[PDB]
Design an enzyme around this catalytic site. Structure first.
Site, PDB file in Angstrom:
ATOM      1  N   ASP A   7       3.086  12.125  11.124  1.00 55.22           N
ATOM      2  CA  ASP A   7       2.548  11.488  10.674  1.00 55.22           C
ATOM      3  C   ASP A   7       1.456   9.819  11.846  1.00 55.22           C
ATOM      4  OD1 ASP A   7       1.857  12.378   8.544  1.00 55.22           O
ATOM      5  OD2 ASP A   7       3.998  11.880   7.903  1.00 55.22           O
ATOM      6  N   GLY A  15       0.687  -1.587  -0.054  1.00 54.99           N
ATOM      7  CA  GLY A  15      -0.002  -0.540   0.383  1.00 54.99           C
ATOM      8  C   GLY A  15       0.756   1.312  -0.026  1.00 54.99           C
ATOM      9  N   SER A  16       0.003   2.528  -0.212  1.00 49.07           N
ATOM     10  CA  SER A  16       0.807   4.163   0.255  1.00 49.07           C
ATOM     11  C   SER A  16       1.096   3.830   1.920  1.00 49.07           C
ATOM     12  CB  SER A  16       0.045   4.408  -0.216  1.00 49.07           C
ATOM     13  OG  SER A  16      -0.201   4.443  -1.774  1.00 49.07           O
ATOM     14  N   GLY A  17       2.426   4.402   1.724  1.00 49.10           N
ATOM     15  CA  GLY A  17       2.799   5.221   2.865  1.00 49.10           C
ATOM     16  C   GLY A  17       3.513   6.807   2.767  1.00 49.10           C
ATOM     17  N   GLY A  67       5.516   7.680  -0.581  1.00 46.87           N
ATOM     18  CA  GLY A  67       5.500   6.330  -1.742  1.00 46.87           C
ATOM     19  C   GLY A  67       4.646   4.682  -1.812  1.00 46.87           C
TER      20      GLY A  67
END
Ligand SMILES: [Cl-]
Ligand SMILES: [Cl-]
Lengths: 263, 265
Positions: free
Chosen positions: A133, A21-23, A26
């Site tokens: 985050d 998945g997305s982090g 990237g």
């Protein structure tokens, strides 16, 4: 005495596999080096001598920030694109357990996870790093049951998901150690309730400003009955709308450490 | 109680990552002398009566073996009713196509189609009706072999409607399933491989899809096939998708046709 060139994982030694998945910055894939790794492909196609040097600078930070409760930086790869290589956490994320598998943690386990996350965040703040985050999505469970915080890297590059946003961030630069503390408060909420905050509000826009102005905050009645009183109190502090009223992580960790002895 | 040499005892499997819902239960990654998949069955308090019924399914499962279907490696009863098979690190065809949007090369796609048809050919030669074939239970092993699953508990036998033949979708409460409705399901799978999408992705109402697909008035838009999908594969797809079920080809022929058209490359 190692240098940036030495942290490159030679081409061909990593087999990239399932896309996860997305982090931040990237896409995360599972991979194989000599063992399991995570690989995050950065969204940068053709890096300028300035961007490559910035990547070098961030990598330089990752190499020296080390703690049992944050992901280990294992190297970077260059082909086909810049990527950050880290250790793999077989236990996936806290988010996946709580909100997708609806895994049932016992209170002692919930508290151990909170403790390890506080240790990790305490180390990052002690190194003057603001995560920006923090959420259950980038809190990882290693196969050995250790918590590994991720997505703390490329911090400076950051200073160029609304549920974990402090109100002063959610209405606005605004990121601080105290906003990290709030996001951690939401993670405590997730742990202690078993659910995401504001699960009864279907529209983001209602949430974004009511939380921003201050007329909306997490329903603490959703907290489990066997949640220690101290834990409930700490959570409420981390979630203070006035950012300067939130505790710092040396304090948060101390409170969770002692609170854990009582058990 | 009563020794069964194919049972895995309550202590010997480590259950790990929850993966998702398959037919009749929930799938887990797990460890039994190495990675396996474990599917926990939706049976709550199994009577000795359903336990014997289950033990009978287990007998059939042991005998059903082919390089292109999952291998039944064991079952458990405690702590819960479970079936154990090998783990496919490549996950499912569905996950790649429609979640990762992995970009397979035409050659690879056709190899997957070829391997899936071989698996389905073996089942059908054993007179087994799959009943639930879809990209969700077509698995890619680490070594690149295709492994079909979800065919077990055949005697015991939602979002699955996309693969349902018209005679199946409209007579769902009447045991409509046949060798021919399997073939249609396989045609939908070819569709996914050759277009990269789920059919009817432009329509919001599942109920509309059921009705229309039931009346024969809605079918997969075959123009959406990639430009380099071979002509023979596009025709085969259309045959597998015929509304008249007896007009659909059988798997011995589907297999042969894919073998050849793959050789032409
Ligand atoms: Cl460096
Ligand atoms: Cl290292």
């Amino acid at each position: 005495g190692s240098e940036f060139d030495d942290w490159e994982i030679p081409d061909g030694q990593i087999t990239v596999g399932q896309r996860i998945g997305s982090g931040s910055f990237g896409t995360v894939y599972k991979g194989k080096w000599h063992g399991d790794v995570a690989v995050k492909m950065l969204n940068v196609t053709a890096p300028t001598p300035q961007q490559l040097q910035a990547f070098k600078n961030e990598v330089g930070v990752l190499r020296k920030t080390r703690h049992v409760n944050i992901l280990l930086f294992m190297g970077y790869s260059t082909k086909p694109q810049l990527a950050i290589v880290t250790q793999w956490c077989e236990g996936s994320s806290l988010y996946h357990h709580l909100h997708a598998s609806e895994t049932k943690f016992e209170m002692k386990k919930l508290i151990d996870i909170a403790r390890q996350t506080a240790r990790g965040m305490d180390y990052l703040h002690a190194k003057s790093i603001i995560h920006r985050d923090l959420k259950s999505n980038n809190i990882f469970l290693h196969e050995d049951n250790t918590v590994k915080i991720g997505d703390f890297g490329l911090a400076t590059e950051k200073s160029r998901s609304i549920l974990w946003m402090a109100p002063e961030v959610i209405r606005m630069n605004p990121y601080s150690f105290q906003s990290d503390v709030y996001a951690f408060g939401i993670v405590l909420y997730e742990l202690m309730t078993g659910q995401l905050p504001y699960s009864n509000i279907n529209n983001r826009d209602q949430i974004i400003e009511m939380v921003g102005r201050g007329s909306l905050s997490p329903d603490l009645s959703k907290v489990r009955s066997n949640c220690p009183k101290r834990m409930k109190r700490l959570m409420a502090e981390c979630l203070k709308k006035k950012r300067d009223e939130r505790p710092s992580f040396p304090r948060i960790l101390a409170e969770i450490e002692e609170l854990a002895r009582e058990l």
